[model samples]
Target: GSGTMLPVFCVVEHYENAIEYDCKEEHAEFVLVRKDMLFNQLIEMALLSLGYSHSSAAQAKGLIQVGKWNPVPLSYVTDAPDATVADMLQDVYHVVTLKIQLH
Candidate 1:
């Protein structure tokens, strides 16, 4: 019953063309996540903010991209089942990249 939460600060990229991406430069957002909970709760909370429902939000786990950048990274180093950020930074930022429902 003792874990600290942190602000992940989410972002979304919905460009039809693979350009302006640099112009866009990674968007911006604000969300506070818990260190105790796994990234599962993170995506659910994130999807809700993006105006999604249980059904539609499935796309998150359907195509999730979270965790740190570089180092051969991963779509979700901490989410869904059997993973938590016990090995992650405490005063850190969580992350997400959603391209739900295609296009």
Candidate 2:
């Protein structure tokens, strides 16, 4: 069933960079994405923007699945397919961290 897109704010923190590289307590790249999107899709989107090859993106997806780093609903309404992102986010924020192992 087609429904309104759920907008989610993705704050990407590039911790892999050296501390001297623009280090700050509240440094992150903000991105907007649909909350209903697949976890793998989100991973691929982020990596693709970072200039990663297609193969590398898929590899990152594999890592995300194996590491079980998918977002879980912190507080979702039952049988509410029409729920907006704001509605879901208003309740509580579930912090699910996905770590990509760089080979």
Candidate 3:
């Protein structure tokens, strides 16, 4: 499990122009995620941290894609169904954008 550690930026963008709050850049949290862990596992964990229920997290699993040329849902990746984030993100400097409506 000596996969290279990649730095991925998880940014949450909120929508709704009429809202009093604007998009803000929060602090960066550095966590060591095992590259061998499934991609869904990482997302499930992230959603859980963001207060998403298990069912919701599971449903939201298909929201990400990792490849460049033939970009496909992370769920489409065979290993993604059972591959670690490090496995899918063997490369470095990736950014994950999560768009949401914060009312």
Candidate 4:
């Protein structure tokens, strides 16, 4: 999991620039990861390990763990700026597309 949807933050008793500076570089890099893609990869891996094929409908559903690979709409990340969120989303999308192409 990446630090996209989830993060760790520490709020100082006083929100000072000194405290902000102290905290800024301490945070880990935010590597965006698509939850769906992660989930599917896990599922697909599990299935393949069990000798099941994703070409089967039930196996595909099992691969996604939700009965379908159809993900939620893009306009869902209401927290971050449109551009940043969109880029993260496209990352997930392209990875999923590649997986589909390969699988």
lDDT of each: 0.48, 0.40, 0.48, 0.30
Q: Is candidate 1 or 4 superior in lDDT? A: 1
Better of 1 and 2 by TM-score: 1
- Candidate 1 lDDT by residue in tens digits, 19-75: 544233334466555666664455566556655566545553333444543322323
TM-score each candidate. Answer: 0.47, 0.34, 0.45, 0.20
Deviation of model 4 at 39, angstroms = 3.6
Report the C-alpha lDDT of model 4 over 12-59, residue by residue, as the tens digit.
111125743732221112233333343323334433433445653243
Looking at candidate 1, the ten consecutive residues that score lowest on lDDT are 94-103
> What is the per-residue lDDT of model 2 for residues 1-103, given as tens digits with 9 covering 90 to 100?
4343432333333324566675422222333445554433554655555455767654432221112445333222234555544454423323433334333
lDDT tens digits, residues 1-103, model 3? Answer: 5555554444332333446775543323434555665666665555555554666554442344333444345556554366667666665436443222222
Q: Which stretches of candidate 2 lie over 4 Å from their true place?
A: 1-30, 61-94
When summed lDDT is taken over every stretch of 10 residues in candidate 2, the lowest stretch is 59-68
Model 2 clashing residue pairs (backbone): none
Candidates sorted on TM-score, descending: 1, 3, 2, 4
Question: How many pairs collide in each candidate, listed in order?
Answer: 0, 0, 5, 0
Report the lDDT of model 1 for residue 23.
35
Sorting all predicted structures by lDDT, with the top scorer first, yields: 3, 1, 2, 4
Model 1: lDDT to the true structure: 0.48
